[PDB]
């Protein structure tokens, strides 16, 4: 009984109406971003999480465009339980802690949508509302995302009740997008205009031009820099396991194979390294060699000398 | 100029086909385009996009997982390095002594360790003529030194 | 067993790399339709195209009969139809 009452009062109720889809989607975009960045069994896990973020965002769009509070309730319940059960499937972390955190924000804003309701006017692109600069910039980069524009169009078409086709739908979306961008620019020119026959202003030029040049620099040079930097880093210690000194003597039959292995080989400690470096400190390059090589790098060649292995 | 008339014609044909099909099968006004039509086209597009990203990954991984051709130890070199100073005991064998286990032989090993699931698993998962026999020689002659 | 010992060039990479390249370029080919379809809705949303296919087919007919003087003349019509969007509206009117 009590459960039924809770659900009844989460569906029928008498509350207000807010549109927090923008923020829910932004939370999911951040989640996607950090999972993509968090590629670090692990690739397979990150790929499944990708498909997941994506599928859940699509389902969210469906319920938003169909204004389903009951559907959102169901989705929320399922998702909460499933994401919390995925904490048990840790077997493939700061990245995961952050993913949990941002998904918690999504669950909080989603819960808000359910307990408030869906507003009558749901259609309309977020970044085409006002014609201040922030809306302009957000709309631009948001649309810039490779497949976001087309996904939005097709998806919306499938849920929204239309008489037309997808091509027709994409036409009105393109027109609107372009018209918004123009409007924002027109508005900003009315807010702040320059005079006629008046230099656009050295500074304006220097700024935009500079940014473009720097962006182009970061297309070619920066990747090279990053690449080389990583490659230069000598990753993990490589120490000779054994010291095999075969003093091949006899031209006919080379022998003298008295040698040693790991037990005799001593990975030099930090203190030991200091000793060697100081021994050869007068000679700059000698010390350099020792010092540059990381501690527990320089290994000790304690080659065995005793015999028994007969000369042949 | 030639390419111009070809482009015009191509586009004009595509338009004509669409116009003809709309005359053959028309639609009413203020009339939902039909849930099903939407579901179909949209679905196909989504699936095509799925096959751009996921399907290649699937295929790639699948092929990589396949362990292609049998790799069996040619020789069983057991050097029982004993003496700390002079490690010896190098009595060992090669391919003649090494026996690529047959299908029947594999069954035997699997059944021997059948009670333990993972033990049997190891043997059974490894393909027949995979598990090789380490018949290492023990006789000496080679002196310790 | 080892995992990759197959043949044919490099099963690991020659044919494989070529396949990937093909897919990408076919990718761009297919994108060539569903990317800028909205940049033509000003010259491509015409109703009746019957009068334009007649023009196009007349160019073809006049090339088979080798009266290439009229090829130049009918090409002039085609390019002016596509030079002035307002005449396209007139020529592509549904009825007349």
């Amino acid at each position: 009984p009590l459960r039924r009452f809770f659900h009844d009062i989460l569906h029928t109720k008498y509350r207000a109406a807010t549109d927090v889809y923008a923020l829910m989607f932004l939370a999911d975009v951040v989640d996607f971003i950090i999972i993509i960045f968090g590629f670090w069994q692990v690739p397979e896990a990150f790929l499944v999480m990708l498909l997941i973020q994506f599928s859940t965002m699509v389902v969210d769009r469906a319920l938003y465009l169909r204004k389903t509070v009951l559907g959102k309730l169901a989705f929320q319940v399922a998702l909460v339980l499933a994401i919390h059960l995925w904490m048990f499937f840790i077997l493939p972390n700061v990245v995961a802690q952050l993913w949990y955190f941002v998904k918690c924000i999504y669950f909080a804003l989603s819960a808000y949508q359910i307990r408030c309701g869906y507003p009558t006017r749901i259609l309309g692109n977020f970044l085409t509302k006002k014609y201040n600069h922030l809306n302009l910039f957000l709309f631009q980069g948001f649309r810039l995302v490779p497949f976001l524009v087309e996904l939005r169009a097709v998806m919306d078409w499938v849920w929204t009740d239309t008489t037309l086709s997808l091509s027709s739908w994409m036409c009105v979306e393109d027109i609107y997008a372009n018209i918004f961008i123009i409007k924002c620019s027109r508005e900003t020119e009315k807010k702040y205009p320059q005079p006629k026959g008046q230099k656009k202003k050295k500074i304006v030029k220097y700024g935009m031009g500079g940014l473009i040049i720097l962006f182009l620099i970061a297309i070619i040079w920066f990747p090279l820099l990053f690449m080389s930097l990583v490659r230069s880093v000598v990753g993990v210690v490589n120490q000779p396991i054994d010291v095999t000194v075969t003093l091949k003597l006899g031209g006919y039959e080379p022998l003298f194979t008295m040698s040693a292995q790991q037990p005799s080989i001593i990975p030099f400690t930090a203190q030991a390294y200091e000793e060697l470096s100081r021994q050869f400190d007068p000679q700059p390059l000698a010390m350099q060699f020792i010092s540059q090589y990381s501690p527990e790098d320089i290994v000790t060649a304690q080659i065995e000398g005793s015999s028994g292995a007969l000369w042949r | 100029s030639w390419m111009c008339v070809e482009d015009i014609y191509a586009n004009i044909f595509i338009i004509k086909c669409s116009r003809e099909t709309e005359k053959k099968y028309p639609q009413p006004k203020g009339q939902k385009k039909k849930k099903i039509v939407k579901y179909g086209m949209g679905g196909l597009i989504i699936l095509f996009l799925i096959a751009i990203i996921w399907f290649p990954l699937l295929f790639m991984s699948l092929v990589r997982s396949v362990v292609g051709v049998v790799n069996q130890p040619i020789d069983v070199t057991v050097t029982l390095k004993l003496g700390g100073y002079e490690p010896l005991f190098t009595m060992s064998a090669q391919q003649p002594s090494i026996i690529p286990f047959t299908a029947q032989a594999y069954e035997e090993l699997s059944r021997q360790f059948d009670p333990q699931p993972l033990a049997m698993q190891f043997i059974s998962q490894y393909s027949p003529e995979d598990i090789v026999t380490a018949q290492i020689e023990g006789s000496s002659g080679a002196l310790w030194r | 067993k080892v995992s990759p010992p197959s043949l044919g060039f490099l099963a690991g990479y020659g044919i494989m790399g070529l396949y990937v390249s093909i897919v990408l370029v076919i990718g761009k080919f297919v994108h060539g339709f569903f990317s800028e379809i909205s940049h033509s809705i000003m010259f491509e949303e015409l109703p009746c195209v019957d009068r334009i296919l007649k023009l196009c087919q007349d160019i073809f007919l006049v090339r088979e009969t080798r009266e290439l003087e009229l090829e130049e003349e009918l090409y002039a019509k085609l390019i002016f139809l596509y030079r002035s969007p307002e005449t396209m509206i007139k020529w592509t009117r549904e009825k007349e």
């Binding site: - | 586009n11 595509i14 579901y39 179909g40 | -």
Partner: peptide, 21 residues
């Protein structure tokens, strides 16, 4: 029947898009 015809129409619409919508 009607359902099949509708499916065919949807298919055409989709593959219609395959050359400038």
């Amino acid at each position: 029947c009607c359902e099949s015809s509708d499916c065919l129409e949807i298919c055409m619409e989709c593959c219609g898009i395959c050359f400038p919508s």
